Design a protein around this ligand. Structure first.
Ligand SMILES: Cc1cc2nc3c(=O)[nH]c(=O)nc-3n(C[C@H](O)[C@H](O)[C@H](O)COP(=O)(O)OP(=O)(O)OC[C@H]3O[C@@H](n4cnc5c(N)ncnc54)[C@H](O)[C@@H]3O)c2cc1C
Ligand SMILES: Cc1cc2nc3c(=O)[nH]c(=O)nc-3n(C[C@H](O)[C@H](O)[C@H](O)COP(=O)(O)OP(=O)(O)OC[C@H]3O[C@@H](n4cnc5c(N)ncnc54)[C@H](O)[C@@H]3O)c2cc1C
Ligand code: HEM
Ligand code: HEM
Lengths: 214, 214
């Protein structure tokens, strides 16, 4: 598929562009960390935040009194998700690069006003990180739900760029004696570290070990 | 110190704020990956990009013809640098969290128009990733320098937020029988992978193994 809109048409390095939903979803599903762009207080602020996908929308949360959740009401935003996958070492400095996956989602986000729906989405967020976890926790209080904003944005107006594989040098540079290659980069998760305030008689759910990213 | 400006004053979770330049520099020095916010084509786009610090400014590069480099001359931007350091598992869903380091730099970026200065800064970028690397490469062409933009932004108008350590539950939840703790997260660098097209007698510089992040 071509780009979904003129404003999502990748121009630079367009050979790296992907617009298909399989790729959009695969990148969104690989990581929890987004960066949301929104005009606030005169600046295109970039807010790091967690996000989760359900079908054709992504969601994020924060304070019901938070400035982003008010500011997103009347402007189109950009939600960017990036993964750095390697440093690409070429024979010329100009052709150094990185391997990566990134997606930009554009458009008008909306807040979930229905508190029952909001709680259902927040359960999906938690259980998407750690299966079954929401049900193990101290039961949520109504005031906690009501203090939380949940925003969502369609994934439809999305552009991706992906780079994999070796360096690509100018054809005339392959006789130059310098070492080229790739340094792979990834997220690593380490074993869980228990809170020292845990009750000694409380087991660790095995599901905690299923959390992964990158 | 307090915030350097009203627009960098952390309000939410203000106890996590840091404004001291030692913390600003330590976060900036830990990672090459930034996200730059800039209003372009009616959207506060969030562009992932590499950056490097020299003293009291950060720098980034791209095409001399790139839209970001044109747009930054006439608006204040936000440059955000985030590091995800762990998933914080609490007894209540409301107090789940993450350990992290993040810095936002605000203000008016500047382009380097002097080609000789630009080339000097680009060598600092490369050798900041891999010591001694620039010298090893196929010598740079004037046209390569001239095709590149380099922008910079002062680090002075900066806010940081940092979270470390265990979960912090409501005090009344500490008798609830659920496991709390932290899943640490970090970047990992893997062994370098040579380009198959490397010349057979050209060894990998040991300095490649010095590249690190996170
Ligand atoms: C980990 C990482 C590191 C990077 N480092 C650098 C760097 O140091 N220097 C540099 O110049 N660029 C870097 N890039 C690429 C950068 O994000 C931009 O893609 C590039 O600079 C072109 O931006 P542009 O606005 O000129 O693109 P244009 O092609 O003019 O943008 C047109 C449209 O393309 C789409 N698009 C553009 N970039 C992306 C993207 N990254 N992901 C998804 N859709 C996109 C958007 O819909 C956008 O509106 C990096 C990307 C990643 C993920
Ligand atoms: C890895 C990571 C994941 C996160 N996940 C979430 C999430 O899922 N939900 C959530 O609500 N928040 C999340 N945060 C925090 C988020 O980035 C914001 O700090 C928070 O949402 C409050 O934003 P605000 O605009 O309401 O802050 P305000 O306090 O109103 O912002 C005022 C000023 O504080 C400064 N500031 C705000 N946030 C930051 C920051 N992160 N770093 C540096 N300076 C800052 C800026 O100068 C800003 O202009 C995450 C942060 C990181 C780094
Ligand atoms: C795995 C799940 C979750 C993670 C990783 C997470 C992470 C975060 C982070 C990082 C912040 C920002 C705090 C700061 O400013 O430093 C935040 C804020 C917030 N979260 Fe969550 N959260 C999770 C689940 C939830 C749930 C399920 C709820 C509601 C039941 C919730 C309610 C809130 C609220 C209300 C805020 C704003 C706090 C304030 O500034 O007053 N969170 N969360
Ligand atoms: C370690 C060093 C470097 C890294 C990691 C790096 C990375 C990148 C990345 C990721 C892009 C974006 C390409 C895309 O759109 O997918 C880029 C673009 C660019 N880089 Fe670099 N780069 C490095 C060094 C340099 C140097 C030293 C020069 C100049 C000598 C240079 C010149 C350019 C130019 C001109 C572009 C724009 C290309 C275009 O779209 O026309 N880069 N770089």
């Amino acid at each position: 598929p071509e780009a979904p809109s003129d404003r999502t048409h990748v121009k630079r390095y367009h050979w790296l562009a992907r617009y298909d939903q399989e790729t959009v979803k695969a990148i969104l599903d690989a990581t929890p960390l987004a960066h949301v762009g929104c005009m606030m207080n005169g600046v295109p602020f970039v807010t790091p935040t967690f996000f989760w996908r359900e079908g054709d929308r992504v969601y994020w949360h924060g304070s019901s009194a938070g400035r982003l959740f008010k500011a997103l009401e009347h402007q189109d935003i950009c939600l960017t998700v990036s993964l750095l996958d390697g440093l690409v070492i070429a024979r010329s400095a100009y052709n150094f690069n990185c391997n990566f996956r990134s997606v930009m989602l554009l458009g008008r986000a909306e807040l979930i006003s229905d508190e029952a729906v909001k709680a259902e989405k927040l359960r999906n967020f938690v259980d998407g990180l750690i299966p079954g976890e929401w049900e193990r926790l101290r039961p949520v209080h109504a005031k906690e739900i009501e203090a939380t904003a949940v925003a969502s944005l369609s994934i439809a107006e999305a552009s991706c760029k992906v780079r994999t594989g070796p360096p690509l040098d100018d054809e005339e540079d392959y006789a130059f004696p310098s070492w080229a290659g790739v340094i792979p980069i990834r997220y690593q998760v380490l074993p869980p570290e228990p809170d020292p305030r845990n009750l000694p008689d409380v087991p660790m759910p095995e599901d905690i070990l299923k959390f992964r990213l990158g």
